[PDB]
Design a protein around this ligand. Structure first.
Ligand code: HEM
Ligand code: HEM
Ligand code: HEM
Ligand code: HEM
Lengths: 141, 146, 141, 146
């Protein structure tokens, strides 16, 4: 349950991130791969080395999904439905793994948003990413 | 656990730049703001009603400094985290009954605080080294549960 | 996301449990207290000994909440709103703890429903209790 | 960890009645049905499309029996779970990269299976003893992560 303040906070953070979003998505992915090596097995066919074009491209996809969620924050289950089907049914992503990427996304934002990453905005961002994660783990069957 | 020399290098170099009078309060404060059930363990602390009240609460600041003291001790004893954290484990597990997931949460908050303070310097390999450290500390603190 | 089969499965299990529901609620609580001693700190003012009238009474409350959820399965966030406010705002219940009670509720059902606790119904019940838990941890602020 | 004599009594007495050719397959099977991402580690196993297909899949049954074998070994070595599970830890952590939360999940599934098979006999104190056992096994299996 995102409050009006949470939505304002998340929107403001998205705004400051600006066109860096895809670059930041790739950085979050890299951080996850190095900090949490178990997550690497979902990408056996990716080269995960620093500067990998595949990780850059995927970071952009991840960023685009998250901004689609922000833009449709009052109906995330609908907006993220196809993506939740993919991660659960086809990829079989362990639900624990969403917390790990969500943490890395926060760390990435914190490392790039000194003014905006206040305790309040940190809280709002954690709730948003938790909400996105809840939808993304909602389709196991 | 076992950090590589490169990881130990990454950790100790960064840590020498940390303000140990402030980062502890900042991390404890964010823990109480971001995961508000944790305020349950801090009822005597007075005003925790808003993020500003939490962060400026002198008891939060004082206690965060003690908490970070223990992290520093862990940093100096990486290959014996269990021994270093034995008394704190009895305290947090047997006396207070804090669920060990909250140890992981505080570690990750500390990571976010370091990222926020150090920016670009907090590189992905630096973070990975710190994630090993906070994982080891959480595991040692939870030993009385195992 | 509960499927039509999940709802049928959960309804059937509730039906077999019948008027034992409150008794089973108390048993689940006792199982949690003995298996997961950290949960005991939320009830400092309860006597948690076997046969405690307070645990019996609370088991009935827990059972009544769960059946209210079953009866309103397509709108659990609304039905469980007051309860989620209580557990988050007033009680400050650690979200980990919902998984522990949910497991104990399953064990209780399994120990009492030999015919009904099939792998399919087990799955359906786990999803239902996970859904109830998601609502009950949805109100932290 | 450390079970009391009463808890060791509860565990060993029940376990002597367990059908070790069946309970393993039942628990592995339910794990794959209830937490379906776990099927990711069993792609070679053939038909896992429905609960009936999973439970009757002879490879699931065969592998569950091996898995339960390791539990039995743990039961005989409660005060040295780490040593008992050292090779399995390397396998599940370093080779397969199974997230350790799934070790906890399988343990809890095993608990549900024991509850289902033994009914009233699986009392709350008996369950509590088993919860210590599966916690210890999951922790030992995850040692390579710590
Ligand atoms: C936390 C929020 C996440 C978001 C917003 C997200 C978003 C996405 C998007 C947009 C795609 C591409 C979709 C498409 O091509 O149709 C994707 C694919 C994928 N994701 Fe995620 N994801 C998330 C978490 C995760 C996690 C935690 C894992 C595993 C640890 C994961 C593993 C994968 C894999 C393996 C693919 C397919 C890559 C390929 O084969 O091309 N995702 N994700
Ligand atoms: C995970 C890393 C943690 C470390 C390194 C740590 C460290 C410490 C230290 C050094 C003390 C001071 C003990 C003394 O006064 O001698 C303390 C006390 C305390 N800690 Fe933590 N702690 C951690 C996590 C937590 C968490 C997650 C919580 C609650 C959610 C918590 C709750 C408390 C409380 C309530 C006290 C005061 C106990 C008392 O004074 O009676 N701690 N901790
Ligand atoms: C998992 C599903 C759960 C359900 C359906 C549930 C249901 C309820 C209900 C119906 C009440 C009484 C509400 C009222 O009196 O207005 C209650 C109270 C309470 N619950 Fe839960 N609960 C759940 C989980 C938990 C967990 C995991 C904990 C802690 C480990 C917990 C701790 C408490 C406490 C401390 C009270 C107040 C007792 C008192 O002071 O009278 N609950 N719950
Ligand atoms: C938690 C308690 C567990 C125990 C005691 C256990 C035990 C075992 C044992 C004894 C083997 C046979 C190794 C051999 O052939 O020499 C095995 C293999 C295997 N386990 Fe588990 N296991 C556990 C959990 C899990 C979980 C949760 C998963 C996946 C979600 C898993 C996935 C596998 C796979 C894929 C193999 C086959 C490896 C191979 O043959 O190459 N295990 N396990």
């Amino acid at each position: 349950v995102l409050s009006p303040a949470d939505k304002t906070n998340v929107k403001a953070a998205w705004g400051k991130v600006g066109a860096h979003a895809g670059e930041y998505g790739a950085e979050a992915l890299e951080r996850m791969f190095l900090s949490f090596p178990t997550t690497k097995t979902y990408f056996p066919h990716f080269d995960l080395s620093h500067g990998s074009a595949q990780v850059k491209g995927h970071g952009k996809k991840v960023a685009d999904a998250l901004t689609n969620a922000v833009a449709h924050v009052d109906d995330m289950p609908n907006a993220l439905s196809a993506l939740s089907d993919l991660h659960a049914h086809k990829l079989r992503v362990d639900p624990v793994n969403f917390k790990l990427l969500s943490h890395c996304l926060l760390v990435t934002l914190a490392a790039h948003l000194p003014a905006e990453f206040t305790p309040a905005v940190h809280a709002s961002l954690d709730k948003f990413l938790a909400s996105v994660s809840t939808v993304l783990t909602s389709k196991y069957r | 656990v076992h950090l590589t020399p490169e990881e130990k290098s990454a950790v100790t170099a960064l840590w020498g730049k940390v303000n140990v009078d402030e980062v502890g309060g900042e991390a404890l404060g964010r823990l109480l703001v971001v995961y508000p059930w944790t305020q349950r363990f801090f009822e005597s602390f007075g005003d925790l009603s808003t993020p500003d009240a939490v962060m400026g609460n002198p008891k939060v600041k004082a206690h965060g400094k003690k908490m970070l003291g223990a992290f520093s001790d862990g940093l100096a004893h990486l290959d014996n985290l269990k021994g270093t954290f034995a008394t704190l484990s009895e305290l947090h597990c047997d006396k207070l009954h804090v669920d060990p997931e909250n140890f992981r949460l505080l570690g990750n908050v500390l990571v976010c605080v370091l990222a926020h303070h150090f920016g670009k310097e907090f590189t992905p390999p630096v973070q990975a080294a710190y994630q090993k450290v906070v994982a080891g500390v959480a595991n040692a603190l939870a030993h009385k549960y195992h």
